Amino acid sequence: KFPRVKNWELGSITYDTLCAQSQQDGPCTPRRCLGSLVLPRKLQTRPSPGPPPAEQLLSQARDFINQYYSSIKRSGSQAHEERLQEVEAEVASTGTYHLRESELVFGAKQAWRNAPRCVGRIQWGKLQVFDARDCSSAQEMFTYICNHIKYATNRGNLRSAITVFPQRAPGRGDFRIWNSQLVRYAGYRQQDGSVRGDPANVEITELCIQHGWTPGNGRFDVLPLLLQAPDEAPELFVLPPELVLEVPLEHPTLEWFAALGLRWYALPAVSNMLLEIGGLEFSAAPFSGWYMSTEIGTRNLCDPHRYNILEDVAVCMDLDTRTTSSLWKDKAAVEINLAVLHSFQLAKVTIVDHHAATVSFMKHLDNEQKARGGCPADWAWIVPPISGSLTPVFHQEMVNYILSPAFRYQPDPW
Amino acid sequence: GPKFPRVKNWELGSITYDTLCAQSQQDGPCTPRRCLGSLVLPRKLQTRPSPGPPPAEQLLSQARDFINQYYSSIKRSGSQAHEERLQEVEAEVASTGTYHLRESELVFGAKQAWRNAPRCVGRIQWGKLQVFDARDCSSAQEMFTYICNHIKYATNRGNLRSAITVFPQRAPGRGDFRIWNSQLVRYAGYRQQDGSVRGDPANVEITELCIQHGWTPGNGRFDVLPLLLQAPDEAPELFVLPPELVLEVPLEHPTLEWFAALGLRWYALPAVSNMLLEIGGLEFSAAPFSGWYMSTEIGTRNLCDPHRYNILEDVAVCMDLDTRTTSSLWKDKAAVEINLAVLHSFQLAKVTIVDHHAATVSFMKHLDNEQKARGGCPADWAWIVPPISGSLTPVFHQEMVNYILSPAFRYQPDPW
Ligand code: HEM
Ligand code: HEM
Ligand SMILES: CC(=N)NCCC[C@H](N)C(=O)O
Ligand SMILES: CC(=N)NCCC[C@H](N)C(=O)O
Ligand SMILES: [Zn+2]
């Protein structure tokens, strides 16, 4: 039935009745918990060469349309009943249907709201939705992306946004953004298999040079985009420098930090996920908000398989890197995170630290408890990578489950 | 590929398949519909008081399974001794409704239970456990003697040795042997008039329970609590631990001279005493165990949790940090220094302790050993990854499969 959910810091308890609406299965079973896994083994997004069972697509649609009219307090109204028949009509005749701009906006916001792994969902209602379904080329995707970047960036005063390109069509190819994010630093594999730049982007980097991109030779070279229209070879487009806002990293008191020459971009814009709304799939729907300092300061810069700058900083800090018990790792991680915050604030670019971010997520949980009777959340992804139990979320139990609309992982186009 | 959970390590890109979970003979709280893995106490393992003797039928299969595990472990599966031991257990259950374990079987089961603990990151030490057999114990008084003996062997003047003391199993129509305290060593939690708590808020209940049972309470911030030991069908008796036996460590920072003036301290012996030890169906309601601390348990959870000592702000103020803004990362800075203090103080006092980095690295070694020896290892990510510097340790990047294997350590309802 309904799971009891406790907060070990306050002693409070709540039941989750929202998970009841979950119409999609996760990777867990009573025999064993696989919630710690990042990617689904079967919850993928298999091909769309043959239409989707009208039985299925139709129930999802009726449900989403139902969701939409409850949202505007016009359920059972006339428009509602007639909107349902339109969908019924279109599906029966073509095997698919289309969303109205307004339904799309509602759908995009709900997908974010439902994202179990997002700690910044308190902002879910503030999302600028760019309808890019009137797109027929890779060059057009690029203009749309450039407009999204400009708006989202807004000279450092970041504004959340999503751009939705054409939905998937049976038997036809997908519109796709090959890059995992609109802005990423190249990863160049060198001599002894080592890597210059972002090791996380080695592959996308190689695919780019393999399509005519002239590579640079730095640690932070902004990658070009590989946009792809249905059944066509992806096309390469370089982003106008003045559009890619970046932040040079320096430390408040450690004068030498700026020397490292480290930097990060201001816009976190995930572009390889799929947006599903009422059964319709949007293979290319890039979204962006703003960074929470740990994503850069802890993960991107200190992960062993990423920039892994932990030792360089510890050495410049003159710390005892001989033993683990000197906590040189913990000490250096704290200064790098401080530098990200300080640097972003100094440059007047939006950013939120992990304490403020998780405090605001706690309010969101409360808001959702009242609004829907629960909130799907993935603990491992919600608790910050450093100072975990120093934040409120750590001490809060959570229920993870899939609701629709939703953002989902999808296979790599190559 | 393999029809078992695929487990990946994102740091090293390596993959493995857990086949050991197929051996799980009990479900957890999750379902295809929703994951409840973050719940601390999900009504599943919960070994609730089942007074009436267990289905001889259910106890038999659990018993049969354990015995097979045991003969497997000594490489004698299918042997004559195995079959005879099998017939024996079945006879004893048939006539008495329960059964008993041989000495060597108890030692094996104890170690397996630790080996099987999903929430323990120090399981690389699982094969080195001192099992004190106290199944002959017949009084709260004798319980106190064994416990003192355990603490003395386990403490070993700072050179800590892992151990477990096993008291009599639960019996049909009889009271359970029970240790009311959550740990052989806990600090008192005094409720204040203004509403606050002096000492450790985690033990307020157990503190009021000793008082209600005759303990003359103190008024310190670190008062070692007495033990409430309960023999079958009898009110728990009260016992006070000889101060010389309870080893404690004063906390000082290596470079911050004022930290020591804070008067902070902690005991060296971490000894869980309220968990149930389950082996082949038999239930050991009282079987306290101990090992040694991983610095973050003390430095981060005990001293910095909001509902515990919560000393973060006090230390941050002494460090002259900006505690009015979150972006100054004042909480982080203070946590680090406090964890450093704990580590430094134990090393100075020559008392066994391991930092979160060393510990997680050794747990990664343990995961590899288990992958080969059993085809996997049940682990609870949220509990394995340290409360500070999570992604800085190797386990953070290691996906993990969680499931229940038996023998096992389980939670049990409070005796009162
Ligand atoms: C307003 C600022 C926002 C902040 C501070 C924020 C922060 C985060 C963080 C920290 C994560 C985890 C990242 C990681 O560990 O890889 C995350 C994940 C996610 N967020 Fe947000 N988010 C924000 C806006 C958005 C927006 C506007 C959307 C969508 C419209 C969104 C959708 C998601 C999704 C789907 C994930 C999971 C991605 C994955 O599985 O890799 N977020 N967010
Ligand atoms: C030798 C060093 C040991 C270390 C460093 C170690 C460390 C840990 C840590 C850090 C935890 C989690 C604590 C928490 O977050 O509350 C834990 C949990 C646990 N350990 Fe170990 N452990 C050790 C010895 C033992 C021994 C000897 C046993 C039993 C024979 C054991 C059984 C368990 C169990 C059952 C749990 C979970 C208890 C619960 O649910 O609260 N550990 N251990
Ligand atoms: C919107 C947002 N804040 N985060 C989405 C994920 C971005 C990724 N963790 C990164 O560090 O680039
Ligand atoms: C054996 C061990 N290291 N830990 C068991 C649990 C102890 C508890 N976390 C505490 O901080 O007292
Ligand atoms: Zn689960």
Q: What is the DSSP string of B105-136?
A: HHHHHHHHHHHH-TT-TTGGGTT--EEEE-TT
The closest CB to that of A31, out of B21, B339, B347, belongs to B21
- List, in order, residues 6 or more apart from A406 with CB less than 8 Å away: A24, A111, A114, A115, A275, A276
The position carrying tokens 């082949």 is: B280
Rounded to 5 degrees, φ, ψ at A236 are -100, 135
- List, in order, residues 6 or more apart from A186 with CB less than 8 Å away: A197, A198, A201, A205, A208, A215, A216, A218, A221, A222, A223
Q: What is the DSSP letter of B54?
A: P
**Nearest-CA residue of chain A relative to B39?**
A397
Residue A32 zone, left/alpha/beta (φ > 0; ψ -120 to 50; rest): beta
Contact A303, B394 (CB under 8 A): no
* Domain match, A63 and A146 both: no
Neighbours of ion ligand 5 (CB under 5 A): A 28, 33, 35; B 30, 35, 37
Q: What is the DSSP letter of B157?
A: G
Q: What three-state secondary structure class fits B182? A: coil
Q: Is residue A376 part of a domain?
A: yes
Q: Of the listed A83, A113, A121, A196, which one is catalytic?
A: A121
Rounded to 5 degrees, φ, ψ at A306 are -120, -145
Contact A279, A187 (CB under 8 A): no
- List, in order, residues 6 or more apart from A214 with CB less than 8 Å away: none
- Residue A301 sits in a domain of what CATH number? 3.90.1230.10
| Separation between Cα atoms, residue A338 and residue A341, nearest integer Å | 5
- Joined tokens for residue B349: 């006092």
Q: Is residue B3 part of a domain?
A: no
Q: What is the DSSP string of A190-225?
A: -TTS-EEE-GGGHHHHHHHHTTT-----SSSPBPPE
| Separation between Cα atoms, residue B277 and residue B288, nearest integer Å | 9
Give the Cα-Cα-Cα angle B410, B363, A399 (nearest 5 degrees): 55
Q: Determine whether the shortest distance from the Cβ of A407 to ligand 1 is under 6 A.
A: yes
Q: Which of B173, B179, B126 lies closest to B151 in space, CA to CA? A: B179
- List, in order, residues 6 or more apart from A193 with CB less than 8 Å away: none
Min distance A177 CA to chain B CA atoms (Å): 23
- List, in order, residues 6 or more apart from B236 with CB less than 8 Å away: B140, B178, B180, B213, B228, B229, B230, B415
* Domain match, A125 and A151 both: no
| Separation between Cα atoms, residue B298 and residue B309, nearest integer Å | 10
- List, in order, residues 6 or more apart from A115 with CB less than 8 Å away: A121, A406, A407
- Paired residues of A227 in beta bridges: A177, A235
Contact A303, A194 (CB under 8 A): no
Give the number of other CB atoms < 10 A from CB of residue B179.
Answer: 27
- Residue A122 sits in a domain of what CATH number? 3.90.340.10
Q: Which residues of A touch B358 (CB under 8 A)?
A: 324-325
Total count of domains within chain A: 3
The position carrying tokens 């704990």 is: B342
* Domain match, B224 and B156 both: yes
For residue B269, the CA-to-ligand 4 centroid distance in Å is: 9
Give the number of other CB atoms < 10 A from CB of residue A50.
Answer: 9
- Residue A239 sits in a domain of what CATH number? 3.90.440.10
| Separation between Cα atoms, residue A326 and residue B254, nearest integer Å | 10
| Separation between Cα atoms, residue B49 and residue A309, nearest integer Å | 53
* CA B46 to chain centroid: 15
* Domain match, A37 and A146 both: no
Contact B404, B45 (CB under 8 A): yes
- Joined tokens for residue B131: 């099992």
Contact A395, A8 (CB under 8 A): yes
Contact between chains at B27 and A25 (C-beta distance less than 8 A): no
Kindly state the helix (H) or strand (E) to which residue A231 belongs, with its residue range.
none
Q: Which of A237, A233, A250, A212 lies closest to A342 in space, CA to CA? A: A250
Q: Is residue B396 part of a domain?
A: no
Distances (CA, A) of B227 to B182, B186, B211, B241, B247: 10, 9, 11, 8, 16
Resolution of this deposited model, Å:
2.0
- Paired residues of A247 in beta bridges: A264
Q: Is residue B395 part of a domain?
A: no
Query: Kind of pairing, strands B163-166 and B130-133?
Result: parallel
| Separation between Cα atoms, residue A100 and residue B377, nearest integer Å | 50
Rounded to 5 degrees, φ, ψ at A136 are -125, 0
B337 exposed, middle or buried (CB, 10 Å; 0-12, 13-18, 19+)?
buried
- List, in order, residues 6 or more apart from A318 with CB less than 8 Å away: none
Rounded to 5 degrees, φ, ψ at B145 are -70, -50
Q: What three-state secondary structure class fits B149? A: helix
In which domain, by residue range, is B40 found? 18-135+162-172+276-290+360-384
* Domain match, A140 and A223 both: yes
A253 exposed, middle or buried (CB, 10 Å; 0-12, 13-18, 19+)?
exposed
* Domain match, B47 and B196 both: no
Q: Is residue B391 part of a domain?
A: no
The position carrying tokens 């919630």 is: A35
Handedness of CA A377, A378, A384, A389 (dihedral sign): positive
- Joined tokens for residue A212: 């005519």
- Joined tokens for residue B413: 């309802």
Contact A277, A64 (CB under 8 A): yes
User: What residues of B are annotated to the active site?
Assistant: 120, 123, 292, 297
The position carrying tokens 């969101």 is: A364
Cis peptide before A411 (omega within 30 of 0): no
Contact B188, B207 (CB under 8 A): yes
Residue B188 zone, left/alpha/beta (φ > 0; ψ -120 to 50; rest): beta
| Separation between Cα atoms, residue A104 and residue A102, nearest integer Å | 5
* Domain match, A297 and A350 both: yes
- List, in order, residues 6 or more apart from A235 with CB less than 8 Å away: A138, A139, A142, A226, A227, A228, A229
Q: What three-state secondary structure class fits A23? A: coil
Rounded to 5 degrees, φ, ψ at A399 are -115, 125
Q: Which of A168, A163, A170, A167 lies closest to A146 in space, CA to CA? A: A163
Counting DSSP H helices and E strands in chain A, the numbers are 11, 18
The closest CB to that of B326, out of A3, A9, A355, belongs to A355
* Domain match, A24 and A165 both: yes
Residue A246 among the catalytic residues = no
Q: What is the DSSP string of A315-347?
A: HHTT--TT-GGG-HHHHHHHHHHHHHHHHHHHT
Q: Is residue A400 part of a domain?
A: no
Cα Rg of chain B, angstroms: 23
Return the amino acid letter for A165.
F
| Separation between Cα atoms, residue A346 and residue B302, nearest integer Å | 36
Distances (CA, A) of A143 to A111, A137, A265, B122: 24, 10, 20, 55
Q: What is the DSSP string of A373-402?
A: S--B--HHHHS-SSSGGGSGGGGB--BB-B
The position carrying tokens 């975990």 is: A388
Contact A138, A228 (CB under 8 A): yes
Distances (CA, A) of A247 to A148, A294, A344, B87: 19, 15, 6, 74
A375 exposed, middle or buried (CB, 10 Å; 0-12, 13-18, 19+)?
buried
Q: Which residues of B touch A32 (CB under 8 A)?
A: 5, 18, 21, 24, 28, 30, 378, 401-403
- List, in order, residues 6 or more apart from A196 with CB less than 8 Å away: A187, A188, A190, A217, A218, A219
* Domain match, B343 and B231 both: no
- Joined tokens for residue B394: 């190797």
Give the number of other CB atoms < 10 A from CB of residue A218.
Answer: 13
Residue A379 among the catalytic residues = no
| Separation between Cα atoms, residue A162 and residue A225, nearest integer Å | 17
**Nearest-CA residue of chain B relative to A21?**
B33
* Domain match, B56 and B152 both: no
- Paired residues of B9 in beta bridges: B398
Return the amino acid letter for A100.
R
Q: Is residue A389 part of a domain?
A: no
* CA A186 to chain centroid: 19
Q: Which residues of B touch A298 (CB under 8 A)?
A: 391-392
Cis peptide before B29 (omega within 30 of 0): no
The position carrying tokens 């399974």 is: B65
Q: Determine whether the shortest distance from the Cβ of A382 to ligand 1 is under 6 A.
A: no
* Domain match, B232 and B141 both: yes
Q: What is the 3-state secondary structure (H, E, C) of A67-112?
A: HHHHHCCCCCCHHHHHHHHHHHHHHHHHCCCCCCHHHHHHHHHHHH
* Domain match, A47 and A149 both: no
| Separation between Cα atoms, residue A42 and residue A52, nearest integer Å | 17
Q: What three-state secondary structure class fits A162? A: strand
Q: Is residue A398 part of a domain?
A: no
Return the amino acid letter for A404.
S
* CA A245 to chain centroid: 19
